[PDB]
Amino acid sequence: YGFQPTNGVGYQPYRVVVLSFELLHAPATVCGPKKSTNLVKNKCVNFNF
Amino acid sequence: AYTNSFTRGVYYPDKVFRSSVLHS
């Protein structure tokens, strides 16, 4: 590419980043910034582990 | 020399517990 500053859009350079989330078969890894909390047994509950 | 394995080289294909279950 011979890039030059006086190029019409669609010929100017764009930077690209491709994030690819993969899930092999480990025990866990990085994730969003949830919050986590306590747990209780013997009660119909809505859980996220 | 060469030799004969009999029933050797079986590994757990992954995590996930499991009990009596002829799993394929």
Structure, explained:
Chain B: This is Spike protein S1. The structure is cut from a larger assembly and holds two copies of chain A. Chain A is 0% helix and 0% strand. Chain A is rod-shaped and about 70 Å long. The chains hardly touch.
Task: Indicate the topology.
This is part of a larger assembly, with 2 copies of chain A.
Chain A: no helix or strand
PDB class: virus
Keywords: SARS-CoV-2, virus
Entry title: S protein of SARS-CoV-2 bound with PD of ACE2 in the conformation 3 (2 up RBD and 1 PD bound)
The major beta sheet of chain A can be summarized as:
none
Strand content of chain A: under 5%
CA radius of gyration of chain A is 23 Å
Determine the structural class of chain A based on helices, strands and strand pairing. Answer: little secondary structure
**Helix content range of the residues of chain A, please?**
under 10%
Quaternary organization: part of a larger assembly
Report the span from N to C terminus of chain A: 48 Å
Overall shape of chain A: it is rod-shaped
Number of helices of chain A: 0
Number of strands of chain A: 0
Protein name (chain A): Spike protein S1
Region (Disordered) (chain A): 25-47
PDB class: virus
Keywords: SARS-CoV-2, virus
